[PDB]
């Protein structure tokens, strides 16, 4: 249908624009849609973009408003004091401010549907909330409405929530437009989605993006496909991948690199209220924190990730246990059988489950997929599903039989409840992934596994050496392979931190010279250098000019292939803030050939200082553009949990950064 009101190019300069005589007598019926294209690159802390109010004395709480915060949050209020209704619906991190030095035109679509008693908000094509109420309040049915306002709400004759920004286009309809119709509305998005709600993964949430440019020109991405909201393990999380063959313009439908089937792949709207938001899937196995590298010699793509058994994460993982038994120099995965209080079993050669107490092989084997067989016959478990139908999280059997895996809750034989690292390989550059295999322990039998640094591995330019950074208490633990990931050795580098999340990413400054940039607990990004291809490592130094929070955030880093200002260049990606995970920047550093020092010469603001930016992935696209896939929200904030479609992709050129 045609709009009932359409207006454009309104400047919001801390002075409301009254549209009462154009709109108010045009509003009719109980369902309305607002379509608004607007910019706000210097917003006030809290500002109303659009308002319908009773502006009369004594009715200050009789209004409808579409508001935003300088955090990037969008929301609505629908209030009527007589009816006793005060709805507030909102979602953090819903907006863009700036891209490539220019204000972003956001496209907002708000549907107020009286038939379904539901209020739905879309920003930039993404549904940010959809709220069903038992008592519907039509937006123009508020008692005594007499003002329609842009850039404020008129309360008792005065301008409240004054806005700074502009509305290039605003339209209103006396209909609740359908989701199909919404999807036809043109967008001017500065970003794309690689992974997204409703795709092949059926995860409603994503975190921990990676990117890597392959020799074919294909660009590969991996990610945590997180099902139980945005929580770290314990949860249900799979590792998903997607690739682009056109310099990031389009991306393949995601597939899994690593997955468990003990719990169903469920698209769940995780509760965000203060009572229920900490609900965590507690009986599922999971993967977490992936990293990718390409091997020159074999042409294989290699992907590593942490593996967590059922119910396990960092918080409850058995410390002082690798989950392996050393027997004359060899490591064998330990197993506990149901009924036993101790781990009496190991997985020997050819998957033979061996009883250590009686020194006899059993009639059980573990196959390549870590599944339990008895006399060659595949054993099964019943899959679980999750729901909030009863008012709290429930995890229950769903009738479906799946192969019994030693990482599962219901398995007859169980692994040590601790963290592991696994690797998978692709021989077709991410079109399919081989079954993963656990990595052996590197710091001994009674030391739990190290934690993989998400992002990229390092493939040294002038050799066959592959390196994945990991971290543990007191050190970075580099995993080095010279034979296409068939065998790994460790290289330990002490850091002056106990129990820190020292997420580390590497660049090769010149042949065999590696600089590692890493997250710390000091509010500063740290670095160390190896001048012997990762064999030995320097003491720790810190970068000035970039701020992080006390808890820190992952930093991504690349060595750019082209000279900038006649010098070799390194690019870092990180939030630059001492307050939160916001103020994302790409920082361009020029290497001094005299001493390998770096002049951090250019700081490119991804978006506003106040808009969210957490974990990130950067890669040089084959055409020398920069691809950035990043968490566009504060992934630490307990106020910004369980947001959909916040991991976003952008394309930048060097001239944008400098």
Curated annotation (Swiss-Prot):
Q: Which GO terms describe its cellular component?
A: cytoplasm; intracellular membrane-bounded organelle; membrane
> Which InterPro entries is this protein grouped with?
BNR_rpt, ConA-like_dom_sf, Glyco_hydro_33_N, Sialidase, Sialidase_fam, Sialidase_sf, Trans_sialidase_dom3
Q: Which residues form the active site?
A: 232 (proton acceptor), 503, 615 (nucleophile)
Q: Which reaction does it catalyse?
A: Hydrolysis of alpha-(2->3)-, alpha-(2->6)-, alpha-(2->8)- glycosidic linkages of terminal sialic acid residues in oligosaccharides, glycoproteins, glycolipids, colominic acid and synthetic substrates
Where do the BNR repeat units fall? Answer: 242-253, 424-435, 479-490, 528-539
The protein, known as: Sialidase B
Query: EC number(s) per UniProt?
Result: 3.2.1.18
The source's superkingdom equals Bacteria
Instruction: Specify one Pfam family.
Output: BNR_2
CDD domains attached to this UniProt entry: Sialidase_non-viral
The UniProt entry's GO biological process terms, in alphabetical order, are: ganglioside catabolic process; oligosaccharide catabolic process
- Provide the alphabetized UniProt keywords: Glycosidase, Hydrolase, Repeat, Signal
In which residues is substrate bound?
207, 519, 581
> Which GO terms of the molecular function aspect are on file?
exo-alpha-sialidase activity
Q: Indicate whether Zinc appears among the record's keywords.
A: no
Family statement? Belongs to the glycosyl hydrolase 33 family.
Keyword field contains Metal-binding: no
């Amino acid at each position: 249908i045609s709009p009932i009101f359409q207006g454009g190019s309104y400047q919001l300069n801390n002075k409301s624009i009254d549209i009462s005589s154009l709109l108010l007598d045009k509003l009719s019926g109980e369902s309305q849609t607002v379509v608004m294209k607007f910019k706000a690159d210097k917003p006030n802390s809290l500002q109303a973009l659009f308002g319908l109010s009773n502006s009369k004395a004594g009715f200050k709480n009789n209004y409808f408003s579409i508001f935003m915060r300088d955090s990037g949050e969008i929301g609505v209020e629908i209030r009527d004091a007589q009816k006793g209704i005060n709805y507030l619906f909102s979602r953090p991190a819903s907006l863009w401010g700036k891209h490539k030095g220019q204000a972003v035109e956001n496209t907002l679509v708000f549907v107020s549907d009286s038939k379904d008693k539901t209020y739905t908000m879309y920003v930039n094509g993404i549904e940010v909330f959809s709220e069903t109420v038992d008592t519907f309040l039509p937006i123009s049915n508020i008692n005594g409405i007499d003002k329609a306002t842009l850039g404020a709400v008129n309360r008792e004759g005065k301008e409240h929530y004054l806005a700074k920004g502009s509305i290039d286009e605003i339209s209103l309809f006396n209909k609740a437009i359908s989701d199909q119709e919404v999807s036809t509305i043109p967008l001017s998005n500065p970003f794309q989605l690689i992974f997204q709600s409703g795709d092949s993964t059926q995860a409603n949430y994503f975190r921990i993006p990676t990117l890597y440019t392959l020799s074919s020109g294909r660009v590969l991405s991996s990610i945590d496909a997180r099902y139980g909201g945005t929580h770290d393990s314990k949860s249900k999380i799979n590792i998903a991948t997607s690739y682009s063959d056109d310099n990031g313009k389009t991306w393949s439908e995601p597939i899994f690199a690593m997955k468990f089937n003990d719990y169903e792949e469920q698209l769940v709207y995780w509760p965000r209220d203060n009572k229920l938001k900490n609900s965590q899937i507690s009986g599922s196995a999971s993967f977490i924190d992936s990293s990718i590298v390409e091997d020159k010699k074999s042409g294989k793509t290699i992907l590593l990730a942490d593996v967590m058994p059922a119910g396990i994460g960092n918080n409850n993982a058995n410390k002082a246990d690798s989950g392996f038994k050393e027997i004359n120099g060899h490591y064998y995965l330990k197993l506990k059988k149901n009924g036993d209080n101790d781990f009496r079993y190991t997985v020997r050669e050819n998957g033979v489950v061996y009883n250590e107490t009686t020194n006899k092989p059993t009639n059980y084997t573990i196959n390549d997929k870590y599944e339990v067989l008895e006399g060659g016959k595949s054993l099964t478990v019943e899959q679980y599903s999750v729901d909030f139908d009863s008012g709290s999280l429930r995890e229950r059997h769903n009738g479906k039989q799946v192969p019994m895996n030693v990482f599962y809750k219901d398995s007859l034989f169980k692994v040590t409840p601790t963290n592991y690292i696994a690797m998978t390989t692709s021989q077709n550059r991410g079109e399919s992934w081989e079954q993963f295999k656990l990595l052996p322990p590197f710091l001994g039998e009674k030391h739990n596994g190290t934690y993989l640094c998400p992002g990229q591995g390092l493939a040294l330019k002038s050799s066959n050496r592959l390196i994945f950074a990991t971290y543990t208490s007191g050190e970075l633990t580099y995993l080095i392979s010279d034979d296409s990931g068939q065998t790994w050795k460790k290289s330990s580098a002490s850091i002056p931190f106990k129990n820190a999340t020292a997420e580390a990413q590497m660049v090769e400054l010149r042949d065999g010279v590696i600089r590692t940039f890493f997250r710390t607990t000091t509010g500063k990004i740290a670095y160390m250098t190896s001048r012997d291809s990762g064999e030995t490592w320097s003491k720790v130094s810190y970068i000035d000019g970039i701020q992080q929070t006390s808890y820190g955030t992952q930093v991504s880093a690349i060595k750019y292939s082209q000279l900038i200002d006649g010098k070799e260049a390194v690019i870092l990606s990180t939030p630059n803030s001492r307050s939160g995970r916001k103020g994302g920047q790409l920082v361009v550093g020029l290497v001094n050939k005299e001493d390998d020092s770096i002049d951090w010469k250019y700081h490119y603001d991804i978006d506003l200082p106040s808009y969210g930016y957490a974990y990130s992935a950067i890669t040089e696209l084959p055409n020398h553009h920069i691809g950035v896939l990043f968490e566009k929200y504060d992934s630490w904030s307990r106020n910004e949990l369980h947001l959909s479609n916040v991991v976003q992709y952008i394309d930048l050129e060097i001239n944008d950064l400098t």
